mmCIF file of N, CA and C in Angstrom:
data_model
loop_
_atom_site.group_PDB
_atom_site.id
_atom_site.type_symbol
_atom_site.label_atom_id
_atom_site.label_comp_id
_atom_site.label_asym_id
_atom_site.label_seq_id
_atom_site.Cartn_x
_atom_site.Cartn_y
_atom_site.Cartn_z
ATOM 1 N N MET X 1 -9.289 -1.984 21.451
ATOM 2 C CA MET X 1 -8.700 -0.799 20.348
ATOM 3 C C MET X 1 -9.168 -1.847 19.196
ATOM 4 N N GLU X 2 -9.050 -0.563 17.511
ATOM 5 C CA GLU X 2 -9.260 -0.419 16.546
ATOM 6 C C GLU X 2 -8.010 -0.485 15.938
ATOM 7 N N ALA X 3 -7.798 -1.491 15.351
ATOM 8 C CA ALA X 3 -6.759 -1.768 14.241
ATOM 9 C C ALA X 3 -5.898 -0.738 13.884
ATOM 10 N N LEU X 4 -7.024 -0.152 13.083
ATOM 11 C CA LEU X 4 -6.633 1.293 12.510
ATOM 12 C C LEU X 4 -5.778 2.277 13.768
ATOM 13 N N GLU X 5 -6.623 2.372 14.441
ATOM 14 C CA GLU X 5 -5.348 3.594 15.294
ATOM 15 C C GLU X 5 -4.281 2.465 16.378
ATOM 16 N N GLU X 6 -4.341 1.449 15.856
ATOM 17 C CA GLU X 6 -2.970 0.383 16.245
ATOM 18 C C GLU X 6 -1.737 0.496 15.470
ATOM 19 N N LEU X 7 -2.445 0.812 14.167
ATOM 20 C CA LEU X 7 -1.493 0.903 12.885
ATOM 21 C C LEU X 7 -0.816 1.932 13.127
ATOM 22 N N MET X 8 -1.833 3.098 13.074
ATOM 23 C CA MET X 8 -1.346 4.815 13.324
ATOM 24 C C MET X 8 -0.236 4.881 14.454
ATOM 25 N N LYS X 9 -0.644 4.067 15.266
ATOM 26 C CA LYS X 9 0.574 3.897 16.369
ATOM 27 C C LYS X 9 1.807 3.254 16.220
ATOM 28 N N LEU X 10 2.014 1.950 15.715
ATOM 29 C CA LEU X 10 2.960 1.352 15.304
ATOM 30 C C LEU X 10 4.362 2.322 14.393
ATOM 31 N N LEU X 11 3.252 2.889 13.419
ATOM 32 C CA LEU X 11 3.916 3.296 12.360
ATOM 33 C C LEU X 11 4.474 5.031 12.686
ATOM 34 N N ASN X 12 4.113 5.434 13.873
ATOM 35 C CA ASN X 12 4.563 6.702 14.334
ATOM 36 C C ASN X 12 3.454 7.658 13.278
ATOM 37 N N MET X 13 2.483 7.240 12.662
ATOM 38 C CA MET X 13 1.815 8.627 11.617
ATOM 39 C C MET X 13 1.339 9.561 12.388
ATOM 40 N N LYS X 14 1.630 10.845 11.448
ATOM 41 C CA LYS X 14 1.079 11.959 11.837
ATOM 42 C C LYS X 14 -0.530 11.970 11.580
ATOM 43 N N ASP X 15 -1.172 10.915 10.759
ATOM 44 C CA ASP X 15 -2.331 11.312 10.547
ATOM 45 C C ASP X 15 -3.003 9.943 10.797
ATOM 46 N N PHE X 16 -4.356 9.823 11.021
ATOM 47 C CA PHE X 16 -5.035 8.415 11.421
ATOM 48 C C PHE X 16 -5.205 7.847 9.615
ATOM 49 N N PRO X 17 -5.468 6.406 9.458
ATOM 50 C CA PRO X 17 -4.800 5.876 8.525
ATOM 51 C C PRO X 17 -6.252 5.467 7.797
ATOM 52 N N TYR X 18 -7.039 6.365 7.699
ATOM 53 C CA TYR X 18 -8.129 6.587 6.681
ATOM 54 C C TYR X 18 -8.570 6.143 5.649
ATOM 55 N N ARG X 19 -7.844 6.362 4.917
ATOM 56 C CA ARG X 19 -7.770 5.928 3.708
ATOM 57 C C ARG X 19 -6.274 5.082 3.109
ATOM 58 N N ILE X 20 -6.509 3.895 2.832
ATOM 59 C CA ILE X 20 -5.334 3.098 2.336
ATOM 60 C C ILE X 20 -5.539 2.551 1.209
ATOM 61 N N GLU X 21 -4.515 2.665 0.575
ATOM 62 C CA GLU X 21 -4.546 2.211 -1.071
ATOM 63 C C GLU X 21 -3.224 1.536 -1.124
ATOM 64 N N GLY X 22 -3.243 -0.084 -1.799
ATOM 65 C CA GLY X 22 -2.453 -1.503 -1.873
ATOM 66 C C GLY X 22 -2.517 -1.557 -3.040
ATOM 67 N N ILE X 23 -1.271 -1.761 -3.557
ATOM 68 C CA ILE X 23 -0.494 -1.659 -4.680
ATOM 69 C C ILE X 23 0.070 -3.268 -4.902
ATOM 70 N N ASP X 24 -0.302 -3.962 -6.126
ATOM 71 C CA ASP X 24 0.845 -5.141 -6.779
ATOM 72 C C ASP X 24 1.213 -4.954 -7.822
ATOM 73 N N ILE X 25 2.059 -5.304 -8.148
ATOM 74 C CA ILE X 25 2.740 -5.416 -9.978
ATOM 75 C C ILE X 25 2.721 -6.662 -9.906
ATOM 76 N N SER X 26 1.717 -7.193 -11.284
ATOM 77 C CA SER X 26 1.965 -8.406 -11.833
ATOM 78 C C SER X 26 2.387 -8.725 -12.802
ATOM 79 N N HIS X 27 3.176 -9.879 -13.797
ATOM 80 C CA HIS X 27 3.424 -9.603 -15.119
ATOM 81 C C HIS X 27 2.493 -9.921 -15.951
ATOM 82 N N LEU X 28 1.705 -10.978 -16.354
ATOM 83 C CA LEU X 28 0.448 -10.672 -17.213
ATOM 84 C C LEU X 28 -0.335 -10.881 -16.555
ATOM 85 N N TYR X 32 3.205 -7.414 -20.914
ATOM 86 C CA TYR X 32 2.457 -6.181 -20.286
ATOM 87 C C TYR X 32 2.639 -6.459 -18.525
ATOM 88 N N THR X 33 2.811 -5.216 -18.214
ATOM 89 C CA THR X 33 2.779 -5.329 -16.870
ATOM 90 C C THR X 33 1.605 -4.673 -16.268
ATOM 91 N N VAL X 34 1.047 -5.371 -14.979
ATOM 92 C CA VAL X 34 -0.110 -4.510 -14.524
ATOM 93 C C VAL X 34 -0.224 -3.659 -12.856
ATOM 94 N N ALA X 35 -0.382 -3.125 -12.799
ATOM 95 C CA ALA X 35 -0.628 -2.875 -11.311
ATOM 96 C C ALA X 35 -2.348 -2.790 -10.868
ATOM 97 N N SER X 36 -1.870 -3.435 -9.919
ATOM 98 C CA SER X 36 -3.575 -3.346 -9.322
ATOM 99 C C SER X 36 -3.672 -3.054 -8.116
ATOM 100 N N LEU X 37 -4.653 -1.456 -7.379
ATOM 101 C CA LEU X 37 -4.701 -0.987 -6.823
ATOM 102 C C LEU X 37 -6.189 -1.079 -6.203
ATOM 103 N N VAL X 38 -6.108 -1.196 -4.679
ATOM 104 C CA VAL X 38 -6.973 -1.952 -3.908
ATOM 105 C C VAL X 38 -7.283 0.068 -2.731
ATOM 106 N N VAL X 39 -8.221 -0.353 -2.316
ATOM 107 C CA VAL X 39 -8.713 1.037 -1.610
ATOM 108 C C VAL X 39 -9.555 0.720 -0.345
ATOM 109 N N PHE X 40 -8.797 0.940 0.806
ATOM 110 C CA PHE X 40 -9.495 0.758 1.893
ATOM 111 C C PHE X 40 -10.166 2.008 2.482
ATOM 112 N N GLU X 41 -11.326 2.633 3.096
ATOM 113 C CA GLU X 41 -11.595 3.598 3.772
ATOM 114 C C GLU X 41 -12.552 3.263 5.166
ATOM 115 N N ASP X 42 -11.533 3.826 6.212
ATOM 116 C CA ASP X 42 -11.891 3.432 7.785
ATOM 117 C C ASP X 42 -11.737 1.794 7.344
ATOM 118 N N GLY X 43 -10.891 0.858 7.112
ATOM 119 C CA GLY X 43 -11.169 -0.390 7.144
ATOM 120 C C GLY X 43 -11.905 -0.927 6.065
ATOM 121 N N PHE X 44 -12.706 -0.507 5.372
ATOM 122 C CA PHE X 44 -13.356 -1.333 4.482
ATOM 123 C C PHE X 44 -12.962 -1.118 3.118
ATOM 124 N N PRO X 45 -12.609 -2.211 2.252
ATOM 125 C CA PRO X 45 -12.935 -1.933 0.764
ATOM 126 C C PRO X 45 -13.722 -1.350 0.045
ATOM 127 N N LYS X 46 -13.503 -0.549 -1.056
ATOM 128 C CA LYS X 46 -13.812 0.188 -1.881
ATOM 129 C C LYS X 46 -13.935 0.059 -3.172
ATOM 130 N N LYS X 47 -14.914 -1.250 -3.429
ATOM 131 C CA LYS X 47 -14.540 -1.731 -5.065
ATOM 132 C C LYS X 47 -14.600 -0.531 -5.848
ATOM 133 N N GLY X 48 -15.703 0.117 -5.675
ATOM 134 C CA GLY X 48 -15.811 1.312 -6.609
ATOM 135 C C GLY X 48 -14.756 2.528 -7.011
ATOM 136 N N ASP X 49 -13.811 2.514 -6.096
ATOM 137 C CA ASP X 49 -12.014 2.541 -5.761
ATOM 138 C C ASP X 49 -11.389 2.218 -6.568
ATOM 139 N N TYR X 50 -11.320 0.919 -7.108
ATOM 140 C CA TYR X 50 -10.094 0.184 -7.448
ATOM 141 C C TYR X 50 -10.204 0.415 -9.068
ATOM 142 N N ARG X 51 -8.511 0.350 -9.069
ATOM 143 C CA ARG X 51 -8.125 0.491 -10.418
ATOM 144 C C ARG X 51 -6.897 -0.178 -11.004
ATOM 145 N N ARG X 52 -7.242 -0.696 -11.845
ATOM 146 C CA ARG X 52 -5.604 -1.577 -12.368
ATOM 147 C C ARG X 52 -5.038 -0.489 -13.765
ATOM 148 N N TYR X 53 -3.746 -0.640 -13.855
ATOM 149 C CA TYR X 53 -2.916 0.257 -14.727
ATOM 150 C C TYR X 53 -2.594 -0.802 -15.523
ATOM 151 N N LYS X 54 -2.099 -0.751 -16.619
ATOM 152 C CA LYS X 54 -1.528 -1.326 -17.985
ATOM 153 C C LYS X 54 -0.053 -0.348 -18.214
ATOM 154 N N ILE X 55 1.033 -1.136 -18.057
ATOM 155 C CA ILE X 55 2.439 -0.344 -18.072
ATOM 156 C C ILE X 55 2.687 -1.374 -19.311
ATOM 157 N N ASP X 61 10.305 -5.387 -14.801
ATOM 158 C CA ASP X 61 10.986 -4.668 -14.067
ATOM 159 C C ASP X 61 9.482 -3.720 -13.585
ATOM 160 N N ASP X 62 9.392 -4.479 -12.386
ATOM 161 C CA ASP X 62 8.853 -4.276 -10.899
ATOM 162 C C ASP X 62 9.079 -2.556 -10.808
ATOM 163 N N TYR X 63 10.109 -2.246 -10.464
ATOM 164 C CA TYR X 63 10.761 -1.170 -9.747
ATOM 165 C C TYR X 63 10.249 0.380 -10.794
ATOM 166 N N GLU X 64 10.436 -0.047 -12.115
ATOM 167 C CA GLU X 64 9.743 0.839 -12.898
ATOM 168 C C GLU X 64 8.565 1.290 -13.271
ATOM 169 N N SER X 65 7.938 -0.033 -12.928
ATOM 170 C CA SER X 65 6.360 -0.219 -12.709
ATOM 171 C C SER X 65 5.750 0.232 -12.093
ATOM 172 N N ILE X 66 5.979 0.388 -10.447
ATOM 173 C CA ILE X 66 5.919 1.009 -9.251
ATOM 174 C C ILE X 66 6.244 2.555 -9.968
ATOM 175 N N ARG X 67 7.523 2.901 -9.998
ATOM 176 C CA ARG X 67 7.369 3.879 -10.176
ATOM 177 C C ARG X 67 6.761 5.010 -11.047
ATOM 178 N N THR X 68 6.608 4.182 -12.536
ATOM 179 C CA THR X 68 5.382 5.393 -13.219
ATOM 180 C C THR X 68 3.729 5.133 -12.795
ATOM 181 N N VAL X 69 3.623 4.373 -11.737
ATOM 182 C CA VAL X 69 2.065 4.201 -11.462
ATOM 183 C C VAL X 69 2.162 5.126 -10.309
ATOM 184 N N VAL X 70 2.841 5.051 -9.591
ATOM 185 C CA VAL X 70 2.608 6.365 -8.277
ATOM 186 C C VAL X 70 2.648 7.672 -8.834
ATOM 187 N N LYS X 71 3.937 7.653 -9.739
ATOM 188 C CA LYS X 71 3.397 9.254 -10.498
ATOM 189 C C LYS X 71 2.337 9.226 -11.063
ATOM 190 N N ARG X 72 1.943 8.613 -12.061
ATOM 191 C CA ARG X 72 0.795 9.044 -12.952
ATOM 192 C C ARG X 72 -0.385 8.952 -12.053
ATOM 193 N N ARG X 73 -0.504 8.351 -10.927
ATOM 194 C CA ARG X 73 -1.970 8.391 -9.973
ATOM 195 C C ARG X 73 -2.057 9.602 -9.233
ATOM 196 N N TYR X 74 -0.401 9.932 -8.887
ATOM 197 C CA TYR X 74 -0.674 10.674 -7.348
ATOM 198 C C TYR X 74 -0.537 12.495 -8.173
ATOM 199 N N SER X 75 -0.314 12.271 -9.738
ATOM 200 C CA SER X 75 -0.311 13.437 -10.209
ATOM 201 C C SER X 75 -1.594 13.889 -10.601
ATOM 202 N N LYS X 76 -2.777 12.870 -10.572
ATOM 203 C CA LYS X 76 -4.318 13.130 -10.752
ATOM 204 C C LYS X 76 -5.061 12.970 -9.966
ATOM 205 N N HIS X 77 -4.447 12.405 -8.410
ATOM 206 C CA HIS X 77 -5.501 12.232 -7.049
ATOM 207 C C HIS X 77 -5.007 12.472 -6.274
ATOM 208 N N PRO X 78 -5.490 12.822 -4.910
ATOM 209 C CA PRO X 78 -5.171 12.602 -3.768
ATOM 210 C C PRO X 78 -4.449 11.948 -3.127
ATOM 211 N N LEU X 79 -3.314 12.088 -2.728
ATOM 212 C CA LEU X 79 -2.460 10.893 -1.509
ATOM 213 C C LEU X 79 -3.174 10.615 -0.419
ATOM 214 N N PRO X 80 -2.987 8.822 -0.524
ATOM 215 C CA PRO X 80 -3.902 8.410 0.520
ATOM 216 C C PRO X 80 -3.309 8.747 1.882
ATOM 217 N N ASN X 81 -3.665 8.065 2.666
ATOM 218 C CA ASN X 81 -3.189 8.294 4.323
ATOM 219 C C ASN X 81 -1.859 7.541 4.673
ATOM 220 N N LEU X 82 -1.689 6.290 3.536
ATOM 221 C CA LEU X 82 -0.709 5.118 3.678
ATOM 222 C C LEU X 82 -0.927 4.437 2.689
ATOM 223 N N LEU X 83 0.404 4.148 1.765
ATOM 224 C CA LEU X 83 0.562 3.581 1.157
ATOM 225 C C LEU X 83 0.883 1.769 1.196
ATOM 226 N N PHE X 84 0.302 1.155 0.967
ATOM 227 C CA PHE X 84 0.681 -0.387 1.266
ATOM 228 C C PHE X 84 1.386 -0.562 -0.441
ATOM 229 N N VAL X 85 2.230 -1.485 -0.194
ATOM 230 C CA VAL X 85 2.965 -1.992 -1.471
ATOM 231 C C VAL X 85 3.434 -3.835 -1.551
ATOM 232 N N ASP X 86 2.612 -4.339 -2.093
ATOM 233 C CA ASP X 86 2.888 -5.890 -1.828
ATOM 234 C C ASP X 86 4.112 -6.444 -2.228
ATOM 235 N N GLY X 87 4.848 -6.549 -1.360
ATOM 236 C CA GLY X 87 6.520 -5.948 -1.499
ATOM 237 C C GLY X 87 7.214 -5.881 -0.759
ATOM 238 N N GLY X 88 8.304 -6.132 -0.639
ATOM 239 C CA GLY X 88 9.422 -5.773 0.171
ATOM 240 C C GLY X 88 9.961 -4.435 0.308
ATOM 241 N N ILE X 89 11.535 -4.830 0.636
ATOM 242 C CA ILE X 89 11.905 -3.223 0.998
ATOM 243 C C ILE X 89 12.234 -2.782 -0.508
ATOM 244 N N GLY X 90 12.818 -3.829 -1.657
ATOM 245 C CA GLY X 90 12.574 -3.137 -2.905
ATOM 246 C C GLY X 90 11.802 -2.479 -3.470
ATOM 247 N N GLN X 91 10.500 -2.609 -2.932
ATOM 248 C CA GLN X 91 9.733 -2.078 -3.847
ATOM 249 C C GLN X 91 8.814 -1.175 -3.311
ATOM 250 N N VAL X 92 9.209 -1.276 -1.994
ATOM 251 C CA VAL X 92 8.512 0.094 -0.949
ATOM 252 C C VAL X 92 9.213 1.082 -0.688
ATOM 253 N N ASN X 93 11.123 0.781 -1.388
ATOM 254 C CA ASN X 93 11.500 2.057 -1.610
ATOM 255 C C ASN X 93 11.439 2.615 -2.895
ATOM 256 N N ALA X 94 10.527 1.713 -3.509
ATOM 257 C CA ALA X 94 10.691 2.376 -5.069
ATOM 258 C C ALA X 94 9.268 3.561 -5.232
ATOM 259 N N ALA X 95 8.492 3.199 -4.575
ATOM 260 C CA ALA X 95 7.662 3.916 -3.905
ATOM 261 C C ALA X 95 7.852 5.100 -3.280
ATOM 262 N N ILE X 96 8.471 5.320 -2.283
ATOM 263 C CA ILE X 96 8.929 6.108 -1.637
ATOM 264 C C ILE X 96 10.001 7.484 -2.407
ATOM 265 N N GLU X 97 10.532 6.573 -3.351
ATOM 266 C CA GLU X 97 11.678 7.414 -3.900
ATOM 267 C C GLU X 97 10.986 7.734 -4.898
ATOM 268 N N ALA X 98 9.724 7.500 -5.764
ATOM 269 C CA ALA X 98 8.831 8.131 -6.875
ATOM 270 C C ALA X 98 8.446 8.954 -5.800
ATOM 271 N N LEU X 99 7.515 8.526 -4.964
ATOM 272 C CA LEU X 99 7.049 10.375 -3.983
ATOM 273 C C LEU X 99 7.824 10.902 -4.046
ATOM 274 N N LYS X 100 8.778 11.167 -3.818
ATOM 275 C CA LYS X 100 9.787 12.246 -3.223
ATOM 276 C C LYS X 100 10.391 12.821 -4.742
ATOM 277 N N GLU X 101 10.443 12.061 -5.585
ATOM 278 C CA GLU X 101 10.779 12.830 -6.963
ATOM 279 C C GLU X 101 9.930 13.747 -7.654
ATOM 280 N N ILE X 102 8.473 13.715 -7.014
ATOM 281 C CA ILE X 102 7.405 14.531 -7.295
ATOM 282 C C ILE X 102 6.806 14.958 -6.307
ATOM 283 N N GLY X 103 7.867 15.421 -4.835
ATOM 284 C CA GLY X 103 7.747 16.296 -4.291
ATOM 285 C C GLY X 103 6.698 15.944 -3.131
ATOM 286 N N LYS X 104 6.148 14.501 -3.047
ATOM 287 C CA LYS X 104 5.009 13.943 -1.964
ATOM 288 C C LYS X 104 5.757 13.262 -1.464
ATOM 289 N N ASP X 105 5.016 13.252 -0.250
ATOM 290 C CA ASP X 105 4.751 12.875 1.033
ATOM 291 C C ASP X 105 3.697 11.850 1.703
ATOM 292 N N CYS X 106 4.282 10.635 2.010
ATOM 293 C CA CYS X 106 2.924 9.880 2.508
ATOM 294 C C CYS X 106 3.853 8.415 2.682
ATOM 295 N N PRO X 107 3.586 8.318 3.855
ATOM 296 C CA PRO X 107 3.930 7.311 4.662
ATOM 297 C C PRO X 107 3.544 5.056 3.863
ATOM 298 N N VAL X 108 4.869 4.690 3.308
ATOM 299 C CA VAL X 108 4.396 3.564 2.723
ATOM 300 C C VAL X 108 5.148 2.573 3.680
ATOM 301 N N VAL X 109 4.209 1.532 3.149
ATOM 302 C CA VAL X 109 4.809 0.316 4.528
ATOM 303 C C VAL X 109 4.446 -1.306 3.564
ATOM 304 N N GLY X 110 5.359 -2.154 3.658
ATOM 305 C CA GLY X 110 5.492 -3.253 2.869
ATOM 306 C C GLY X 110 5.191 -4.635 4.039
ATOM 307 N N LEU X 111 5.373 -5.758 3.644
ATOM 308 C CA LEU X 111 5.473 -6.703 3.911
ATOM 309 C C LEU X 111 7.069 -7.500 3.748
ATOM 310 N N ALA X 112 7.977 -8.498 4.753
ATOM 311 C CA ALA X 112 9.322 -8.651 4.123
ATOM 312 C C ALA X 112 8.832 -9.824 3.439
ATOM 313 N N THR X 117 6.866 -9.778 9.072
ATOM 314 C CA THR X 117 7.579 -8.437 9.256
ATOM 315 C C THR X 117 7.084 -7.394 8.387
ATOM 316 N N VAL X 118 6.878 -6.720 9.073
ATOM 317 C CA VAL X 118 6.734 -5.201 8.293
ATOM 318 C C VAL X 118 7.667 -4.367 7.966
ATOM 319 N N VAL X 119 8.098 -3.965 6.259
ATOM 320 C CA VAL X 119 8.674 -3.319 6.250
ATOM 321 C C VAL X 119 8.280 -1.903 6.070
ATOM 322 N N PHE X 120 9.172 -1.111 6.505
ATOM 323 C CA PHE X 120 9.103 0.292 6.917
ATOM 324 C C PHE X 120 9.963 1.347 7.415
ATOM 325 N N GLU X 121 10.141 2.033 6.843
ATOM 326 C CA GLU X 121 11.159 3.374 7.339
ATOM 327 C C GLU X 121 12.833 2.930 7.099
ATOM 328 N N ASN X 122 12.998 1.554 5.940
ATOM 329 C CA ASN X 122 14.269 1.016 5.717
ATOM 330 C C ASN X 122 14.376 0.073 6.706
ATOM 331 N N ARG X 123 13.699 -0.413 7.399
ATOM 332 C CA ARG X 123 13.870 -1.030 8.403
ATOM 333 C C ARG X 123 12.628 -2.088 8.559
ATOM 334 N N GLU X 124 12.940 -3.199 9.188
ATOM 335 C CA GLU X 124 12.076 -4.294 9.598
ATOM 336 C C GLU X 124 11.767 -4.335 10.866
ATOM 337 N N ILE X 125 9.955 -4.512 11.240
ATOM 338 C CA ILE X 125 9.565 -4.853 12.276
ATOM 339 C C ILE X 125 9.246 -6.327 12.722
ATOM 340 N N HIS X 126 9.184 -7.256 13.247
ATOM 341 C CA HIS X 126 8.459 -8.256 13.495
ATOM 342 C C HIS X 126 7.650 -8.088 14.562
ATOM 343 N N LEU X 127 6.549 -8.742 14.197
ATOM 344 C CA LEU X 127 5.439 -8.716 14.701
ATOM 345 C C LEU X 127 4.858 -9.940 15.096
ATOM 346 N N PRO X 128 4.240 -10.250 16.231
ATOM 347 C CA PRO X 128 3.386 -11.334 16.744
ATOM 348 C C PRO X 128 2.738 -11.932 15.428
ATOM 349 N N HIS X 129 2.557 -13.074 15.185
ATOM 350 C CA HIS X 129 1.821 -13.543 14.410
ATOM 351 C C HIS X 129 0.197 -13.194 14.622
ATOM 352 N N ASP X 130 -0.640 -12.635 16.050
ATOM 353 C CA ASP X 130 -1.845 -12.563 16.275
ATOM 354 C C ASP X 130 -1.834 -10.751 16.565
ATOM 355 N N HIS X 131 -0.753 -10.488 16.102
ATOM 356 C CA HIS X 131 -0.860 -8.521 16.516
ATOM 357 C C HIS X 131 -1.750 -8.294 15.476
ATOM 358 N N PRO X 132 -2.719 -7.677 16.259
ATOM 359 C CA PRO X 132 -3.849 -6.923 15.168
ATOM 360 C C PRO X 132 -3.371 -5.878 14.360
ATOM 361 N N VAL X 133 -2.188 -5.396 14.074
ATOM 362 C CA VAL X 133 -1.550 -4.998 12.957
ATOM 363 C C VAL X 133 -0.840 -5.503 11.995
ATOM 364 N N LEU X 134 -0.243 -6.935 12.175
ATOM 365 C CA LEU X 134 -0.064 -7.863 11.515
ATOM 366 C C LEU X 134 -1.498 -8.092 10.519
ATOM 367 N N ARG X 135 -2.416 -8.745 11.367
ATOM 368 C CA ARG X 135 -3.444 -9.186 11.042
ATOM 369 C C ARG X 135 -4.415 -8.235 9.919
ATOM 370 N N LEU X 136 -4.414 -6.746 10.255
ATOM 371 C CA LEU X 136 -4.896 -5.569 9.096
ATOM 372 C C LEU X 136 -4.099 -5.948 7.936
ATOM 373 N N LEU X 137 -2.436 -5.693 8.126
ATOM 374 C CA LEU X 137 -1.815 -5.449 7.011
ATOM 375 C C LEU X 137 -1.934 -6.817 5.899
ATOM 376 N N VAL X 138 -1.951 -8.072 6.468
ATOM 377 C CA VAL X 138 -2.350 -9.170 6.058
ATOM 378 C C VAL X 138 -3.530 -9.325 5.205
ATOM 379 N N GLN X 139 -4.553 -8.552 5.963
ATOM 380 C CA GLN X 139 -5.640 -8.247 5.119
ATOM 381 C C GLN X 139 -5.834 -7.641 3.871
ATOM 382 N N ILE X 140 -5.106 -6.382 3.959
ATOM 383 C CA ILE X 140 -4.847 -5.936 3.157
ATOM 384 C C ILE X 140 -4.072 -6.120 1.934
ATOM 385 N N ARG X 141 -2.691 -6.849 2.311
ATOM 386 C CA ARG X 141 -2.139 -7.368 1.261
ATOM 387 C C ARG X 141 -2.760 -8.776 0.420
ATOM 388 N N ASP X 142 -4.152 -9.622 1.471
ATOM 389 C CA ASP X 142 -5.014 -10.341 0.522
ATOM 390 C C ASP X 142 -5.946 -9.921 -0.683
ATOM 391 N N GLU X 143 -6.264 -9.095 0.046
ATOM 392 C CA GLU X 143 -7.322 -8.285 -0.992
ATOM 393 C C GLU X 143 -6.305 -7.706 -2.229
ATOM 394 N N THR X 144 -5.067 -7.022 -2.097
ATOM 395 C CA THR X 144 -4.566 -6.354 -3.000
ATOM 396 C C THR X 144 -4.004 -7.527 -4.229
ATOM 397 N N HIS X 145 -3.935 -8.771 -3.502
ATOM 398 C CA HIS X 145 -3.603 -10.373 -3.894
ATOM 399 C C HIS X 145 -4.868 -10.649 -5.010
ATOM 400 N N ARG X 146 -6.121 -10.831 -4.374
ATOM 401 C CA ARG X 146 -7.375 -11.385 -4.834
ATOM 402 C C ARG X 146 -8.068 -10.254 -6.105
ATOM 403 N N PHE X 147 -7.429 -9.086 -6.017
ATOM 404 C CA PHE X 147 -7.635 -8.261 -6.990
ATOM 405 C C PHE X 147 -6.599 -8.438 -7.979
ATOM 406 N N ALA X 148 -5.676 -8.513 -7.493
ATOM 407 C CA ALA X 148 -4.243 -8.901 -8.910
ATOM 408 C C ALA X 148 -5.021 -9.788 -9.890
ATOM 409 N N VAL X 149 -5.270 -11.167 -9.032
ATOM 410 C CA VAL X 149 -5.125 -12.515 -9.610
ATOM 411 C C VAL X 149 -6.475 -12.655 -10.496
ATOM 412 N N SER X 150 -7.479 -11.744 -10.122
ATOM 413 C CA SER X 150 -8.625 -12.173 -11.047
ATOM 414 C C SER X 150 -8.461 -11.290 -11.988
ATOM 415 N N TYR X 151 -7.183 -11.073 -12.155
ATOM 416 C CA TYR X 151 -7.050 -10.012 -13.866
ATOM 417 C C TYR X 151 -7.093 -10.903 -15.547
#
């Protein structure tokens, strides 16, 4: 089986995670770095950095971006529950619905899901996090 299908099932997603966006907030101005995976592959032409209090930063970027662009099927936030929940609140505040996941163990729906190290979904989420971080650290 494919990791994307397994991710869909783990998170009980309504939609297949065809487009995943990943966001990291870093401090050196605050910069939000955003990566894009399409069908599991990075799409570097679609990467973004926003120049702009990590919760306020996430809120601003989420609202700036999704007032101009379609939601992904899944948003990954390189952070734990506080950042994940900041993104969820920001989306709700503008009347938009998209699942948000992070890593604390997966952070999802105000809960944590511990996965075995080699679980394919954990491995995929780590890959997304690592690409998010690679892009951020490069600025």
